[PDB]
Coordinates of C-alpha atoms and ligand atoms in Angstrom, one line a residue:
Chain A
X1 CA -50.2 -134.5 -47.4
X2 CA -48.9 -131.5 -49.5
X3 CA -48.7 -131.2 -53.3
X4 CA -45.9 -129.8 -55.4
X5 CA -45.9 -128.1 -58.8
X6 CA -42.8 -127.5 -60.8
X7 CA -43.4 -124.5 -63.4
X8 CA -41.0 -123.7 -66.4
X9 CA -39.9 -120.4 -67.9
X10 CA -42.1 -118.8 -70.3
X11 CA -40.7 -119.3 -73.8
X12 CA -39.7 -115.8 -74.6
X13 CA -37.7 -115.6 -71.4
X14 CA -35.2 -118.2 -72.7
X15 CA -34.6 -116.8 -76.1
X16 CA -33.8 -113.1 -75.1
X17 CA -30.8 -112.3 -73.1
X18 CA -32.9 -109.3 -72.1
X19 CA -35.1 -111.6 -70.1
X20 CA -34.6 -113.7 -67.0
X21 CA -35.9 -117.2 -67.2
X22 CA -36.8 -119.0 -63.9
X23 CA -38.3 -122.2 -62.7
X24 CA -41.0 -121.7 -59.9
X25 CA -41.3 -124.7 -57.5
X26 CA -44.6 -124.3 -55.6
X27 CA -45.8 -126.3 -52.5
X28 CA -49.4 -126.0 -51.8
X29 CA -51.6 -127.5 -49.2
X30 CA -49.0 -127.1 -46.2
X31 CA -50.6 -127.6 -42.7
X32 CA -50.2 -125.6 -39.5
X33 CA -49.3 -129.0 -37.8
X34 CA -45.9 -128.7 -39.6
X35 CA -45.4 -125.9 -42.0
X36 CA -41.8 -126.2 -42.3
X37 CA -41.0 -126.7 -45.9
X38 CA -37.5 -127.3 -47.2
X39 CA -36.3 -126.9 -50.7
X40 CA -33.3 -128.6 -52.4
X41 CA -32.5 -127.7 -56.0
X42 CA -30.7 -129.7 -58.4
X43 CA -29.7 -129.1 -61.9
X44 CA -28.8 -132.1 -63.9
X45 CA -28.1 -134.2 -60.8
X46 CA -25.9 -131.6 -59.0
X47 CA -27.5 -129.5 -56.5
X48 CA -27.6 -125.7 -56.5
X49 CA -28.4 -123.3 -53.8
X50 CA -28.9 -120.1 -55.7
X51 CA -32.7 -120.3 -55.2
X52 CA -34.7 -117.5 -53.7
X53 CA -37.4 -119.0 -51.4
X54 CA -40.2 -116.6 -50.5
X55 CA -41.7 -117.0 -47.0
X56 CA -44.8 -119.0 -46.2
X57 CA -48.2 -117.6 -47.3
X58 CA -51.3 -118.9 -45.6
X59 CA -54.2 -119.1 -48.1
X60 CA -58.0 -119.1 -47.4
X61 CA -58.2 -122.9 -47.1
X62 CA -56.3 -122.2 -43.9
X63 CA -53.3 -123.8 -45.7
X64 CA -49.7 -122.7 -46.3
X65 CA -48.0 -122.2 -49.5
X66 CA -44.4 -121.9 -50.3
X67 CA -42.7 -120.7 -53.4
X68 CA -39.1 -121.2 -54.3
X69 CA -37.7 -119.6 -57.5
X70 CA -34.5 -120.6 -59.2
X71 CA -33.2 -118.4 -62.1
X72 CA -31.7 -120.3 -64.9
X73 CA -29.0 -119.6 -67.6
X74 CA -30.5 -119.4 -71.0
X75 CA -27.9 -121.7 -72.6
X76 CA -28.5 -124.2 -69.7
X77 CA -32.2 -124.4 -70.5
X78 CA -31.7 -124.5 -74.3
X79 CA -28.9 -127.2 -73.8
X80 CA -31.5 -129.3 -72.1
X81 CA -30.5 -129.3 -68.5
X82 CA -32.9 -131.0 -66.0
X83 CA -34.0 -129.1 -62.9
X84 CA -35.2 -131.1 -59.8
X85 CA -37.2 -129.3 -57.0
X86 CA -37.0 -131.5 -53.9
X87 CA -39.5 -130.7 -51.0
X88 CA -39.1 -131.8 -47.4
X89 CA -41.8 -131.7 -44.7
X90 CA -42.1 -133.6 -41.5
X91 CA -45.7 -134.8 -42.4
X92 CA -44.9 -136.3 -45.7
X93 CA -43.4 -139.9 -45.3
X94 CA -41.0 -139.3 -48.2
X95 CA -39.8 -135.9 -49.8
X96 CA -41.8 -135.1 -53.0
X97 CA -39.6 -134.7 -56.2
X98 CA -39.9 -133.1 -59.5
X99 CA -37.8 -132.9 -62.5
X100 CA -38.4 -130.4 -65.5
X101 CA -36.8 -129.4 -68.9
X102 CA -37.7 -128.3 -72.2
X103 CA -39.1 -131.3 -74.2
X104 CA -36.4 -133.8 -75.4
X105 CA -35.6 -133.8 -79.0
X106 CA -33.8 -132.2 -81.9
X107 CA -34.6 -128.6 -82.6
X108 CA -36.5 -128.2 -86.0
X109 CA -36.6 -124.7 -87.7
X110 CA -40.1 -123.3 -88.1
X111 CA -41.4 -122.2 -91.4
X112 CA -43.7 -119.2 -91.4
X113 CA -46.3 -118.4 -94.0
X114 CA -49.0 -115.7 -94.3
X115 CA -52.2 -116.1 -95.8
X116 CA -54.4 -113.3 -97.0
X117 CA -58.1 -113.7 -96.1
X118 CA -60.2 -115.8 -98.2
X119 CA -62.1 -114.0 -101.1
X120 CA -65.5 -114.6 -99.4
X121 CA -64.4 -113.0 -96.2
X122 CA -64.3 -109.7 -98.4
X123 CA -68.1 -109.7 -98.1
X124 CA -68.0 -109.2 -94.3
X125 CA -66.7 -106.2 -92.3
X126 CA -63.6 -107.6 -90.7
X127 CA -61.3 -110.0 -92.6
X128 CA -59.0 -112.6 -90.9
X129 CA -55.3 -112.8 -91.7
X130 CA -53.5 -116.0 -91.2
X131 CA -50.1 -117.0 -89.9
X132 CA -49.0 -120.6 -90.3
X133 CA -46.0 -121.8 -88.4
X134 CA -44.8 -125.3 -89.4
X135 CA -42.2 -128.0 -88.5
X136 CA -40.8 -126.7 -85.3
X137 CA -39.5 -128.7 -82.5
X138 CA -39.8 -128.2 -79.4
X139 CA -43.4 -126.8 -79.2
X140 CA -42.5 -123.7 -76.9
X141 CA -42.8 -120.8 -79.4
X142 CA -43.8 -117.2 -79.3
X143 CA -46.1 -115.7 -81.9
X144 CA -47.7 -112.2 -82.5
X145 CA -48.5 -109.5 -84.8
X146 CA -47.4 -105.9 -85.5
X147 CA -48.3 -103.2 -88.0
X148 CA -45.6 -100.5 -88.6
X149 CA -43.4 -101.5 -85.8
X150 CA -46.6 -101.4 -83.3
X151 CA -48.3 -104.4 -81.9
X152 CA -51.7 -105.4 -83.1
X153 CA -54.5 -106.0 -80.6
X154 CA -56.9 -108.3 -82.0
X155 CA -55.4 -111.8 -82.7
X156 CA -55.9 -115.1 -81.3
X157 CA -53.2 -117.9 -81.5
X158 CA -53.9 -121.6 -81.4
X159 CA -51.8 -123.8 -79.4
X160 CA -49.0 -125.9 -81.1
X161 CA -50.0 -129.4 -81.9
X162 CA -48.2 -132.6 -83.0
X163 CA -48.0 -133.0 -86.9
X164 CA -47.7 -136.3 -88.6
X165 CA -43.9 -135.8 -88.9
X166 CA -43.4 -135.5 -85.1
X167 CA -42.9 -131.8 -85.2
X168 CA -45.5 -129.2 -84.4
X169 CA -47.3 -126.4 -86.1
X170 CA -49.9 -123.6 -85.3
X171 CA -52.0 -120.9 -86.8
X172 CA -52.6 -117.3 -85.3
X173 CA -55.8 -115.4 -86.7
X174 CA -55.5 -111.6 -86.7
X175 CA -58.8 -109.7 -87.4
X176 CA -58.6 -106.3 -89.0
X177 CA -61.3 -104.1 -90.2
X178 CA -61.9 -104.3 -93.9
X179 CA -60.6 -100.8 -94.6
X180 CA -57.0 -101.1 -93.1
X181 CA -56.5 -104.2 -95.3
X182 CA -57.9 -102.6 -98.5
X183 CA -55.6 -99.6 -98.2
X184 CA -52.5 -101.8 -98.3
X185 CA -51.2 -101.5 -94.6
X186 CA -48.5 -103.9 -94.1
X187 CA -49.1 -106.4 -91.4
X188 CA -46.4 -108.7 -89.8
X189 CA -46.2 -112.1 -88.2
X190 CA -43.3 -112.4 -85.9
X191 CA -42.2 -115.6 -84.2
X192 CA -39.5 -116.5 -81.6
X193 CA -37.9 -119.8 -81.2
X194 CA -34.8 -121.6 -80.4
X195 CA -33.9 -123.0 -83.8
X196 CA -34.3 -119.7 -85.6
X197 CA -31.2 -117.5 -86.4
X198 CA -31.1 -115.1 -83.6
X199 CA -34.3 -116.7 -82.3
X200 CA -36.5 -114.4 -84.3
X201 CA -38.1 -114.4 -87.7
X202 CA -40.9 -112.3 -89.2
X203 CA -42.9 -112.4 -92.4
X204 CA -45.2 -109.7 -93.7
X205 CA -48.5 -109.8 -95.5
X206 CA -50.3 -107.0 -97.4
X207 CA -52.8 -106.7 -100.3
Chain B
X1 CA -58.3 -143.7 -54.2
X2 CA -61.0 -144.0 -56.8
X3 CA -61.0 -141.0 -59.0
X4 CA -63.9 -140.3 -61.4
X5 CA -64.0 -138.6 -64.7
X6 CA -67.0 -138.3 -67.2
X7 CA -66.6 -137.6 -70.8
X8 CA -69.1 -136.4 -73.4
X9 CA -70.1 -138.0 -76.6
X10 CA -68.2 -137.3 -79.8
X11 CA -69.5 -134.2 -81.7
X12 CA -69.8 -136.2 -85.1
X13 CA -71.9 -138.8 -83.2
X14 CA -74.6 -136.4 -82.0
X15 CA -75.3 -134.7 -85.5
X16 CA -75.6 -137.8 -87.6
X17 CA -78.1 -140.5 -86.6
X18 CA -75.9 -143.2 -88.3
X19 CA -73.6 -143.0 -85.2
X20 CA -74.0 -143.8 -81.5
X21 CA -73.5 -140.7 -79.2
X22 CA -72.3 -142.2 -75.9
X23 CA -71.5 -140.6 -72.5
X24 CA -68.5 -142.5 -71.1
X25 CA -68.0 -142.6 -67.4
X26 CA -64.4 -143.8 -66.4
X27 CA -63.1 -144.6 -63.0
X28 CA -59.5 -144.8 -62.3
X29 CA -57.0 -146.2 -59.7
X30 CA -59.3 -149.1 -58.8
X31 CA -57.5 -151.5 -56.5
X32 CA -57.9 -155.2 -56.8
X33 CA -59.7 -156.0 -53.3
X34 CA -62.7 -153.9 -53.8
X35 CA -63.4 -153.8 -57.6
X36 CA -67.2 -154.6 -57.5
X37 CA -67.9 -151.0 -59.1
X38 CA -71.5 -150.3 -59.5
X39 CA -72.8 -147.7 -62.1
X40 CA -76.1 -146.0 -62.3
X41 CA -76.9 -143.5 -65.0
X42 CA -79.5 -140.7 -64.6
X43 CA -80.9 -138.3 -67.4
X44 CA -82.4 -134.9 -66.3
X45 CA -83.0 -136.3 -62.8
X46 CA -85.0 -139.4 -63.9
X47 CA -83.4 -142.6 -64.7
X48 CA -83.0 -145.1 -67.6
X49 CA -81.1 -148.2 -67.8
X50 CA -79.5 -148.6 -71.3
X51 CA -75.9 -148.6 -69.8
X52 CA -73.2 -151.0 -70.6
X53 CA -70.3 -151.5 -68.2
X54 CA -67.4 -152.5 -70.8
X55 CA -64.5 -154.5 -69.7
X56 CA -61.3 -153.4 -68.2
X57 CA -57.7 -153.3 -68.6
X58 CA -54.5 -152.6 -66.6
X59 CA -51.9 -150.0 -66.3
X60 CA -48.4 -150.1 -64.8
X61 CA -50.3 -148.5 -61.8
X62 CA -51.1 -151.8 -59.9
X63 CA -54.6 -150.7 -60.9
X64 CA -57.3 -151.1 -63.5
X65 CA -60.1 -148.8 -64.9
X66 CA -63.6 -149.8 -65.1
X67 CA -65.6 -147.9 -67.9
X68 CA -69.2 -147.7 -68.4
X69 CA -70.8 -146.1 -71.5
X70 CA -74.4 -144.9 -71.8
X71 CA -76.3 -144.6 -75.1
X72 CA -78.0 -141.3 -75.6
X73 CA -80.5 -140.0 -77.9
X74 CA -79.6 -137.2 -80.4
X75 CA -82.3 -134.7 -79.5
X76 CA -81.7 -135.1 -75.8
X77 CA -78.1 -134.4 -75.6
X78 CA -78.3 -131.5 -78.0
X79 CA -81.3 -130.1 -75.9
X80 CA -79.0 -129.8 -72.8
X81 CA -80.1 -132.7 -70.6
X82 CA -78.0 -133.5 -67.7
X83 CA -76.3 -136.8 -67.4
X84 CA -75.3 -138.3 -64.0
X85 CA -73.0 -141.2 -63.3
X86 CA -73.2 -142.5 -59.7
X87 CA -70.2 -144.7 -58.9
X88 CA -70.9 -146.8 -55.9
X89 CA -67.9 -148.4 -54.2
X90 CA -67.1 -149.7 -50.6
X91 CA -63.5 -148.9 -51.3
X92 CA -64.8 -145.4 -51.8
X93 CA -65.8 -143.5 -48.7
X94 CA -69.1 -142.6 -50.5
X95 CA -70.8 -142.5 -53.9
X96 CA -68.6 -140.2 -55.9
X97 CA -71.1 -138.6 -58.3
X98 CA -70.7 -136.5 -61.5
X99 CA -72.8 -134.6 -63.9
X100 CA -72.3 -133.2 -67.4
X101 CA -74.2 -131.5 -70.1
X102 CA -73.9 -129.8 -73.4
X103 CA -72.7 -126.3 -72.8
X104 CA -75.4 -123.7 -72.8
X105 CA -75.6 -120.8 -75.2
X106 CA -77.5 -119.9 -78.3
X107 CA -75.6 -121.9 -80.9
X108 CA -74.1 -119.8 -83.7
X109 CA -73.3 -120.9 -87.2
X110 CA -69.6 -121.5 -88.4
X111 CA -67.9 -119.4 -91.0
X112 CA -65.8 -121.8 -93.4
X113 CA -63.1 -120.4 -95.6
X114 CA -60.5 -122.1 -97.6
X115 CA -56.9 -120.8 -97.7
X116 CA -54.8 -121.8 -100.7
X117 CA -51.0 -122.4 -100.2
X118 CA -48.7 -119.4 -99.8
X119 CA -46.6 -118.7 -102.8
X120 CA -43.5 -119.4 -101.0
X121 CA -44.5 -122.8 -99.8
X122 CA -44.0 -123.8 -103.3
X123 CA -40.3 -124.3 -103.0
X124 CA -40.5 -127.6 -101.1
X125 CA -42.0 -130.9 -101.8
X126 CA -45.4 -130.8 -99.9
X127 CA -48.0 -128.3 -99.9
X128 CA -50.2 -127.4 -96.9
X129 CA -54.0 -126.5 -97.7
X130 CA -55.7 -124.5 -94.9
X131 CA -59.3 -124.5 -93.8
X132 CA -60.6 -121.8 -91.5
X133 CA -63.7 -122.4 -89.3
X134 CA -64.5 -119.5 -87.1
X135 CA -67.5 -117.9 -85.3
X136 CA -69.1 -121.1 -84.2
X137 CA -70.6 -121.9 -80.6
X138 CA -70.8 -124.3 -79.0
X139 CA -67.1 -125.6 -79.4
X140 CA -67.9 -129.2 -80.3
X141 CA -67.2 -129.5 -84.1
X142 CA -66.0 -132.0 -86.6
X143 CA -63.9 -131.3 -89.7
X144 CA -62.8 -133.6 -92.4
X145 CA -61.0 -133.5 -95.8
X146 CA -61.8 -135.3 -98.9
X147 CA -60.9 -135.3 -102.7
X148 CA -63.7 -136.2 -105.3
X149 CA -65.4 -138.3 -102.9
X150 CA -63.0 -140.1 -101.1
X151 CA -61.5 -139.1 -97.9
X152 CA -58.0 -137.5 -97.4
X153 CA -55.7 -139.0 -94.7
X154 CA -52.8 -136.5 -94.1
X155 CA -54.5 -133.6 -92.4
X156 CA -54.5 -132.3 -88.7
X157 CA -56.9 -130.1 -87.0
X158 CA -56.4 -127.3 -84.3
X159 CA -58.6 -127.6 -81.2
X160 CA -61.3 -125.0 -80.9
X161 CA -60.0 -121.7 -79.9
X162 CA -62.2 -119.1 -77.7
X163 CA -61.9 -115.9 -79.7
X164 CA -62.9 -112.5 -78.4
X165 CA -66.7 -112.3 -79.3
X166 CA -67.3 -115.5 -77.3
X167 CA -67.2 -117.6 -80.5
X168 CA -64.6 -120.2 -81.3
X169 CA -62.4 -120.8 -84.3
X170 CA -60.1 -123.5 -85.6
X171 CA -57.9 -124.4 -88.4
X172 CA -57.1 -127.6 -90.6
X173 CA -53.9 -128.3 -92.3
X174 CA -54.4 -130.9 -95.1
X175 CA -51.1 -131.9 -96.6
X176 CA -51.4 -132.5 -100.3
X177 CA -48.5 -133.5 -102.5
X178 CA -46.8 -131.2 -105.0
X179 CA -48.7 -132.3 -108.2
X180 CA -52.1 -133.3 -106.9
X181 CA -52.4 -129.4 -106.2
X182 CA -50.5 -128.2 -109.1
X183 CA -52.4 -130.5 -111.5
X184 CA -55.8 -129.3 -110.7
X185 CA -57.3 -131.5 -108.1
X186 CA -60.1 -130.2 -106.1
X187 CA -59.9 -130.7 -102.3
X188 CA -62.8 -130.2 -99.8
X189 CA -63.2 -129.2 -96.2
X190 CA -66.2 -130.7 -94.6
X191 CA -67.6 -129.2 -91.4
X192 CA -70.2 -130.9 -89.2
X193 CA -71.8 -128.6 -86.5
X194 CA -75.0 -128.1 -84.5
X195 CA -76.2 -124.9 -86.1
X196 CA -75.2 -125.9 -89.8
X197 CA -78.2 -126.6 -91.8
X198 CA -78.3 -130.3 -92.0
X199 CA -75.4 -130.2 -89.5
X200 CA -73.0 -130.4 -92.4
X201 CA -71.7 -128.1 -95.1
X202 CA -68.6 -128.3 -97.3
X203 CA -66.0 -125.9 -99.0
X204 CA -63.9 -126.6 -102.1
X205 CA -60.4 -125.4 -102.9
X206 CA -58.6 -125.9 -106.2
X207 CA -55.8 -123.8 -107.7
Ligands
LIG301 C1 -57.1 -124.3 -51.0 O1 -56.7 -123.3 -51.8 C2 -55.5 -123.3 -52.3 C3 -55.0 -122.0 -52.6 O2 -55.7 -121.6 -53.9 C4 -56.2 -120.2 -53.8 O3 -56.9 -119.9 -52.6 C5 -58.1 -120.6 -52.4 C6 -58.5 -120.0 -51.0 C7 -59.0 -120.3 -53.5 O4 -59.4 -119.0 -53.5 C8 -58.4 -120.8 -54.8 O5 -59.3 -120.3 -55.9 C9 -57.1 -120.0 -55.0 O6 -56.6 -120.3 -56.2 C10 -55.5 -124.4 -53.5 O7 -54.2 -124.5 -54.0 C11 -54.5 -124.8 -55.5 O8 -54.1 -126.2 -55.4 C12 -54.3 -126.7 -56.7 C13 -54.1 -128.3 -56.6 O9 -55.1 -128.9 -55.9 C14 -53.4 -126.1 -57.8 O10 -53.9 -126.6 -59.0 C15 -52.8 -126.9 -60.1 O11 -52.6 -125.9 -61.0 C16 -51.6 -126.0 -62.0 C17 -51.3 -124.6 -62.6 O12 -51.5 -123.5 -61.7 C18 -51.2 -122.3 -62.3 O13 -52.4 -121.7 -62.8 C19 -53.3 -121.2 -61.8 C20 -54.5 -120.7 -62.6 O14 -54.3 -121.0 -63.9 C21 -52.7 -120.3 -60.9 O15 -53.6 -119.8 -59.9 C22 -51.4 -120.8 -60.3 O16 -50.9 -119.9 -59.4 C23 -50.5 -121.3 -61.4 O17 -50.0 -120.0 -62.0 C24 -48.7 -120.2 -62.4 O18 -47.8 -119.9 -61.5 C25 -46.3 -120.1 -62.0 C26 -45.5 -119.8 -60.8 O19 -45.3 -118.5 -60.4 C27 -46.1 -119.0 -63.0 O20 -44.8 -119.2 -63.6 C28 -47.2 -119.1 -64.1 O21 -47.0 -118.2 -65.1 C29 -48.4 -119.1 -63.6 N1 -49.5 -119.3 -64.7 C30 -50.7 -118.6 -64.7 C31 -51.7 -119.1 -65.7 O22 -51.2 -118.0 -63.8 C32 -51.8 -127.1 -62.8 O23 -50.5 -127.4 -63.5 C33 -52.4 -128.4 -62.1 O24 -53.0 -129.4 -63.1 C34 -52.3 -130.5 -63.3 O25 -52.4 -131.5 -62.0 C35 -53.8 -132.2 -62.0 C36 -53.8 -133.1 -60.9 O26 -53.3 -132.4 -59.7 C37 -54.1 -132.8 -63.3 O27 -55.5 -133.2 -63.1 C38 -54.2 -131.7 -64.4 O28 -54.8 -132.4 -65.6 C39 -52.7 -131.4 -64.7 O29 -52.0 -132.5 -64.7 C40 -50.7 -132.0 -65.1 O30 -50.6 -132.1 -66.5 C41 -49.4 -131.5 -66.9 C42 -49.6 -131.4 -68.4 O31 -50.7 -130.6 -68.8 C43 -48.3 -132.3 -66.5 O32 -47.0 -131.7 -66.9 C44 -48.3 -132.5 -65.0 O33 -47.3 -133.5 -64.5 C45 -49.5 -132.9 -64.4 N2 -49.7 -132.9 -63.0 C46 -49.4 -133.9 -62.3 C47 -49.5 -133.6 -60.8 O34 -49.2 -135.0 -62.6 C48 -53.3 -128.1 -60.9 O35 -54.6 -127.9 -61.5 C49 -53.3 -124.6 -57.9 O36 -52.4 -124.0 -58.5 C50 -53.3 -124.1 -56.4 N3 -53.7 -122.7 -56.4 C51 -53.0 -121.5 -56.5 C52 -53.5 -120.3 -56.6 O37 -51.7 -121.8 -56.5 C53 -55.9 -125.7 -52.8 O38 -56.0 -126.8 -53.7 C54 -57.2 -125.6 -51.9 N4 -57.5 -126.9 -51.2 C55 -58.6 -127.4 -51.0 C56 -58.6 -128.8 -50.3 O39 -59.7 -126.8 -51.1
LIG302 C1 -52.5 -144.9 -63.2 O1 -52.7 -144.8 -64.7 C2 -53.9 -144.2 -65.2 C3 -53.9 -144.1 -66.6 O2 -53.1 -142.9 -67.2 C4 -52.2 -143.2 -68.2 O3 -51.4 -144.1 -68.0 C5 -50.7 -143.7 -66.9 C6 -50.4 -145.0 -66.3 C7 -49.5 -142.8 -67.2 O4 -48.8 -143.5 -68.3 C8 -50.1 -141.7 -67.8 O5 -49.2 -140.9 -68.5 C9 -51.4 -141.9 -68.7 O6 -52.2 -140.7 -68.7 C10 -54.0 -142.8 -64.4 O7 -55.3 -142.2 -65.0 C11 -55.1 -140.7 -65.2 O8 -55.5 -140.0 -64.1 C12 -55.3 -138.7 -64.4 C13 -55.6 -137.8 -63.1 O9 -55.4 -138.8 -62.0 C14 -56.2 -138.2 -65.6 O10 -56.1 -136.7 -65.8 C15 -57.4 -136.4 -66.0 O11 -57.6 -136.1 -67.5 C16 -58.8 -136.0 -67.8 C17 -59.0 -136.2 -69.4 O12 -58.4 -137.4 -69.6 C18 -58.5 -137.8 -71.1 O13 -57.3 -137.5 -71.7 C19 -56.2 -138.1 -71.2 C20 -54.8 -137.6 -71.7 O14 -55.0 -136.3 -72.1 C21 -56.3 -139.7 -71.4 O15 -55.3 -140.4 -70.9 C22 -57.7 -140.1 -70.9 O16 -57.9 -141.4 -71.2 C23 -58.8 -139.3 -71.2 O17 -59.1 -139.7 -72.5 C24 -60.6 -139.6 -72.8 O18 -61.3 -141.0 -72.7 C25 -62.7 -141.1 -72.8 C26 -63.1 -142.4 -72.6 O19 -64.2 -142.7 -73.4 C27 -63.0 -140.4 -74.3 O20 -64.5 -140.3 -74.4 C28 -62.4 -139.0 -74.4 O21 -62.7 -138.5 -75.7 C29 -60.9 -139.2 -74.2 N1 -60.3 -137.8 -74.3 C30 -59.0 -137.6 -74.7 C31 -58.5 -136.3 -74.8 O22 -58.3 -138.7 -74.8 C32 -59.3 -134.6 -67.3 O23 -60.8 -134.4 -67.4 C33 -59.0 -134.3 -65.9 O24 -58.8 -133.0 -65.7 C34 -59.9 -132.4 -64.9 O25 -60.0 -132.8 -63.5 C35 -58.5 -132.6 -63.0 C36 -58.7 -133.1 -61.5 O26 -58.9 -134.4 -61.5 C37 -58.1 -131.2 -63.0 O27 -56.8 -131.0 -62.7 C38 -58.3 -130.7 -64.5 O28 -58.1 -129.3 -64.5 C39 -59.8 -131.0 -64.9 O29 -60.5 -130.3 -64.0 C40 -61.8 -130.0 -64.4 O30 -62.0 -128.9 -65.2 C41 -63.2 -128.7 -65.5 C42 -63.4 -127.4 -66.5 O31 -61.9 -127.2 -66.9 C43 -64.1 -128.2 -64.3 O32 -65.5 -128.0 -64.7 C44 -64.0 -129.5 -63.3 O33 -64.7 -129.2 -62.2 C45 -62.6 -129.9 -63.1 N2 -62.6 -131.1 -62.3 C46 -61.7 -131.3 -61.2 C47 -61.0 -130.1 -60.9 O34 -61.8 -132.4 -60.5 C48 -57.6 -135.0 -65.4 O35 -56.5 -134.1 -65.7 C49 -55.9 -139.0 -66.9 O36 -56.8 -138.8 -67.9 C50 -55.9 -140.6 -66.5 N3 -55.4 -141.4 -67.6 C51 -56.2 -142.3 -68.2 C52 -55.6 -143.0 -69.4 O37 -57.4 -142.6 -67.8 C53 -54.0 -142.9 -63.0 O38 -54.2 -141.8 -62.3 C54 -52.7 -143.6 -62.5 N4 -52.6 -143.8 -61.0 C55 -51.6 -143.3 -60.3 C56 -51.6 -143.5 -58.8 O39 -50.7 -142.6 -60.9

């Protein structure tokens, strides 16, 4: 039979009133022998009906795929409400069911530290600048880099990972050409997360 | 139905002969009535016979997991020989087969740098020493922390991260306490990797 996938809102959508956070329920591998798919949404037990269900799109398997999308309220998601996608189809013996939410626990405030490049990286052409983010819970974050109010292109950010305390941490490595660091250009690590004041902090690094 | 995964040896294991690099074939969702499970292992198309089907256990899934591990040689796995776990079963339609190998690509030597604690981490009790390993390929790697010969225990390690130049990087956060740093203890990041001379180097860090 068919398979269901329940996708959450990207982190930054739930921290800015500017954005629109949503949950996407996706049914894949729907057949022509009955491609009637029915969506029932529930938040925290009680069913909602404010979901927008796109029409079936057949794929190149020769299989149908249906996407229902439910907008959330930022406070709802951050107050840890559970969202149930329920999928009905006359093939399936029993309706498939999915619950989703942010990961249960107590919010823990991240601590950001910026580390200048190691002295030995001076002998190369492009030095690495480091942003360490520690002690945050849950793990959905957002990290990136700006220099003079404008984003920096060349940085990779490692995923979050469970520390010994049960909270998370990460690093992001921004690679700049040796000159821009030498001159004293100020660089800037910004992070977004529920347990920050106004969901935003930023620390800067410069020679 | 019987689903098959096949996991490669541990990085540390292939770079030091003291250890036993092993390829571990794992079958899942094996149901009581047909659990004979064959295994046959092949190397570069041929076949050798130094396998060892270990014992089993049981999850809350009404099913068990047979697990067979094969001993490998350190100069064959690192030379990119393909490894094949045929898993014959009558519960299965047919012989589900699988094949793994070391990732191909000219190995590249890792860059190892040691990041001392940011000034503003000094407010709080514990301090976090950073180690940055970057520019390595393939992604298999092992990092460890030690002080004056004995291994440190309070560290964590990011997974390899694919950068931009097709190299990988990673970080390591060894948490050392207040005064061990501040007194003058030397801490050391040790990296083991395919392309390192003697598959191992080390980098120090004192205040
Ligand atoms: C026939 O084809 C169809 C259609 O596919 C398309 O058309 C064909 C013709 C080909 O061209 C295809 O190449 C083409 O893609 C196939 O349909 C596919 O079906 C598979 C399932 O067999 C689905 O795989 C799952 O993928 C999800 C993640 O999917 C995201 O990322 C994809 C690429 O990165 C992207 O293509 C998807 O659209 C989707 O993208 C996200 O979409 C949301 C909603 O809009 C959006 O908000 C996101 O921003 C967006 N993200 C990105 C990056 O784009 C993955 O989660 C699944 O893995 C889980 O399940 C596995 C077991 O099923 C398990 O082994 C994994 O380890 C993992 O397990 C999960 O683990 C997590 C924690 O890690 C846990 O929380 C979960 O509980 C656990 N899961 C379970 C079930 O327990 C899975 O890999 C494809 O999405 C789907 N393709 C598309 C395009 O949707 C079909 O299979 C083909 N059939 C045959 C027989 O050939
Ligand atoms: C009944 O229970 C068992 C046991 O599960 C455990 O207990 C149950 C009861 C629950 O409590 C679970 O929460 C718990 O996990 C169930 O068995 C599980 O089955 C699922 C899928 O059905 C497996 O997911 C796969 O995961 C592997 C990686 O698994 C490692 O990590 C797991 C956790 O992260 C860990 O639990 C495993 O033990 C395993 O650990 C490894 O063990 C070996 C042993 O020697 C060791 O050497 C390793 O070092 C060690 N590693 C770690 C990190 O621990 C993953 O490989 C699979 O993903 C591939 O395949 C998917 C499709 O099957 C696909 O979605 C993925 O994207 C990915 O696809 C591959 O991608 C590559 C490149 O990306 C591509 O080239 C391939 O073509 C592609 N292959 C495809 C598409 O097929 C997969 O996600 C669980 O691991 C497994 N758990 C255990 C413990 O075995 C069982 O399913 C249950 N039955 C029912 C009916 O529910």
